[PDB]
Structure formats: structure tokens, C-alpha cells
Amino acid sequence: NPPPPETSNPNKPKRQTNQLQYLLRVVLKTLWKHQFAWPFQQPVDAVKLNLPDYYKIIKTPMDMGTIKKRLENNYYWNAQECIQDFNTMFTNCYIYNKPGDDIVLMAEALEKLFLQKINELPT
Template sequence: TTGAAGSGSCGIGGGNPIVVEAPALQTTLLAMRQLVKSLFSHASSKPFREPVDYLKLQLFHYPSVITKPMDLGTIQKRLDQSAYERVDQLRADIDLVWENCITFNGATSWIGKEAGTLRKFAEKKFVQAKLSPN
């Protein structure tokens, strides 16, 4: 995998988290799964599908810069394990992927620009799926 992810705040809005009650839970989980699937399918997502292999890439300082790594594959596993109880938890992890990348590589690097593209794409998908916290 090329590229890297970074640490930092996720940039999700304030306010009350969305807590999903039982009848709506299955519908919401399905929408969350479809959203993550759409991120995997995006042409720019390949560098973000697996954890950064910083040893292979000889980015030995990566763990000192990125203290909370996140990638789409890990998000998919967490979703499959029902680790997300609220939409804002999923959103925070997705935002963290892009924040990590930009923190480590810079917003103007090619991979930072890809992260920016995917951030906008993800936001659009959250709104379309009515998973926006507002």
C-alpha cells in the first residue's frame, strides 16, 4: 500500500450523537455498510483500504506522528463485528483516515489530495444516506 494516514481531530460537527433505536438499527447498519462499500469502490480508495505498512515503506517515524492509525479495511471489520453503536462513531473513524493521511503527507501531496477527494465523497454519501448527525 502506498500513502499514509495521520492523527488529528476528525472534524465532525458538535451536537448530540445520533443513537439508533432497535427497529431503525438494521436499516441504519445497512446504510452504514453500503456507505463503506461505496468508499471501497471509489477509484481513489486503494491506498486507504489497508493499514499503512510503515515498515515495508520504510516510514519508521510513522507511529510517532500517527498515534491512532485508521483505514477502510479496519472500519469494515469493525462494522462487521457490530463495533459501531452510533453513526458518529463510524463517521469519526472515516474522518480519521483522511485526517491521518493529510497530517502525515500534507494536504498538497498527491495522496493528501486523494484524501480530500474521498472526504468530500464520504460527506456526500453520509448526507445521501441520511446518516448526517445534523
């Protein structure tokens, strides 16, 4: 396993915004309870899950546990930075797998719920 993505960085510029607050309270915490969220709540453990090729293929890993920690730690500058992490998470799943896989069906459903939730954000 590589080290997991950072969740703090003292030199990184950070901000507290209504949209980032909403991404934690509403978007992340709603996705988290979905029946399909569980593969995405923690970094992929390639040793535990017996996927020795995972980090051979996925070079920018991302997961909702990391995102949740980043939001709780005030890691982001703006909502777009957070949204990019979700997009990276979903794309990683499509890249490492293929159409029709169970994990991909899960990511597809979550991504559609995610887009529904960020379609309108607070001002």
C-alpha cells in the first residue's frame, strides 16, 4: 500500500464556506448512508482486498473517508476542490474496473445521486 492521501497540510490555503459546509452536512453525509457507499468509505487496502494491481493502475486514489476527513479538517479552499475529489473517486472506479461490474454499478448510482445533490448549492 502507498500512504493514503493527506487530510491536513499546514501550508495549504484553507477556507470556510457555506458551500463546503453543505458538501459535508448534506452531500457527503447523505451519500455515506446509501446502500452502495461502503466500498467508498475508506482508501482501497490493496493488501487486504488482494488487489496487488490496484495502485499499479490508480495513481491518484480518492475515497469518501478521506473527503470526509478533509471537510472536517477544513482542508479545502472551495467547493470545486471538494467536488474534484469526488470526481476523482468515481473516475478511479471506472478506470480500475469495466462496464457492468458490481462495483461500477455502485459508483454509477452514487455519482448520479452526487450530481443531483450538487446541482444546486447554497449561495
